[model samples]
Target: GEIKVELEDSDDVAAACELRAQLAGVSIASGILLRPAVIRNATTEFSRKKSEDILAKGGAAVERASAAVDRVSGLDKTNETAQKVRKAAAVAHHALEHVKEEVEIVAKKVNEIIELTAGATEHAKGAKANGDASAVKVSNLLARAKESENQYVKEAAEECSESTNYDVTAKSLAAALDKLPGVKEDNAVKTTFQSILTSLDNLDKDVKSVEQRAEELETALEKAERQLEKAEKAAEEAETESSKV
Candidate 1:
């Protein structure tokens, strides 16, 4: 009878397979996670742009409203036409108040997102320290996320630079309004209403643009969360394998 010999498979094969699988999984997960961060950054850039647009238009509206208010304020209350102008001015003032509040809300939320992103990066870094290869990939991805955040910050700063322009315009409008003669007829009142309506329409457009940009950023954040889940799962699987070995 011929001697039978059994050759055992090399451990290197299994080790290589394990490493390759882990590395590939990590690479894919990292890319997926990073996509959302990039998109979020882009949205932030858009938000800053939208804010500038809104502030510009808001300043214009404020100017017009202030002028109208001054004109109406000077009118004698006994005059029928003056009363109508005053009423229209009141409406414009209310609308301006709403716009100011909304802009503040937008600004606050943008800052919140910035802070949230910073925390997320920290979490990703901590997660990377685990033995799982995927965790390391996630850490690398979080590093890139910082780049996106930086870009957004730069854009927002640029937009904020226009604040002085809006301030100047608002002041000028107020001064002009202070010197205006009050309206004397109902037709003049209607004209004030129409002007306010036009300004309100522009404000609406600016607000909608800001909201849309924020929504886009939210969508991107959701995508990033999904990718993070994948990475976490992959890391868990690696931990399980190591335990068995």
Candidate 2:
């Protein structure tokens, strides 16, 4: 005999799924287990998003804990604690090097403009009516230098902003860990005290030093631009004088 149609019109999708599972030879208990597997598959993407958020939060916590340790151990210049502090500091130094080298290059570009502007001013006076060509060359040179300086400043500013965020996060983490009972003994947290804490110290300092370098570079560019304006003025005066001759 043919199997009877056991489903009701009102039974809906759940009953139909159960009937299909029975035909496939799965037990009712096993189907329940299999149900969660399907549900887990559907939710995995959502779980991954949460995982990323937790990772970032955990990172910030470590940053702060390290900062706290560094602050406490900072008293002795030759203290044994500094050895532990280098963990985070090492990475900070590595990243800071990139910014520092770029700043050096930017500084060199500004210096070039300053020196070239000086020479262009003297050249304009010596050439008199013919000085317009030299003046144009100086203008073009300053424009290119200014562009490079601006691009460098933009990059440095973005990096400084990230450094500021890291500093703030590390401070907060340190404060929270300090409030925890027996935080120094907590195994998971103790790792920060012994190692990461000193790292935060150097991390903070590296950020500040790099920021200072960026500021100095900006100031130098400003001075170079002013020199360029004066050079252009000198060239114009020579051109007017040659016209009268």
Candidate 3:
């Protein structure tokens, strides 16, 4: 007859959630599906919270693994176990990216919704800064972007190929930015920025020859990169953690 009445509850271990719908009196409880809006709201919020949780957990894993790689006392990194650990860490780095990628999409989208929507919250002159929608979105986007970028760098440190890919992409982006319409206004600004873009291209020109200098090394790096990404994705969806990671 009622949703719930006078309940006091559990002392420990709440391991699972049961997602379903219910009615107060007539319909069977947990028998119907949730409404579309409710589902979206629930899942997006879940994804947002879990993004940080898994990020910490994954980062901790990375720290431990990378520590294992560093603690190898022998000079020969060629040792089978040491090599394997490095490879695994590389893979873990990529794996973490998938989680980061999810946060990136979610935070950016939510921020967009707040700023562009007609009902965006207005800040009063006497209020503290964060009561405004614009401030909230900016703060969120800044933190989220920082997390994604940190994971990216940490991941890149594990593999030569991944490092190269990042370098190529970074330079390419700067070159792209050079073409922005606003840059057309200042010749001195244009000239200075143009130098960095040009240098980036020149640096990338040598990557192919460098990658070919040692075939086994390159192969090993590439393999580590792929295997790690695969490892992360494998962990994904099967189960999921903490922030200090």
Against the reference, the lDDT scores of all candidates come to 0.38, 0.34, 0.34
Q: Please report how far candidate 3 places residue 53 from its true position, in Å.
A: 1.3
Give me candidate 1's TM-score against the actual structure: 0.42
Q: Model 2: runs farther than 4 Å from truth?
A: 1-168, 179-192
Better of 1 and 2 by TM-score: 1
* Segments in model 3 whose C-alpha atoms lie over 4 Å from true places: 1-43, 73-75, 113-245
TM-score of 3: 0.32
* Residue range 75-152, candidate 1, lDDT tens digits: 566766555444544454454455455555556657655654454343333322221332233223323333434554
Steric overlap count per candidate? 0, 4, 5
Shift in Å, residue 147, candidate 2: 64
10 residues in a row with least lDDT, candidate 2? 160-169
lDDT at 48, model 3: 49
Model 2 scores a TM of 0.28
Better of 1 and 3 by TM-score: 1
Candidate with best TM-score:
1
Best-to-worst ranking by lDDT: 1, 2, 3
On residues 1-245, what C-alpha lDDT tens digit does candidate 2 reach at each position? 11122212222222222222221221222223223323333443443343334334334434443454455453455544443344433443333333334434454543443443334333223322221222232223223333334554333322321111112223443453344334234343244333333433433343344344444555543443443333333333333332332
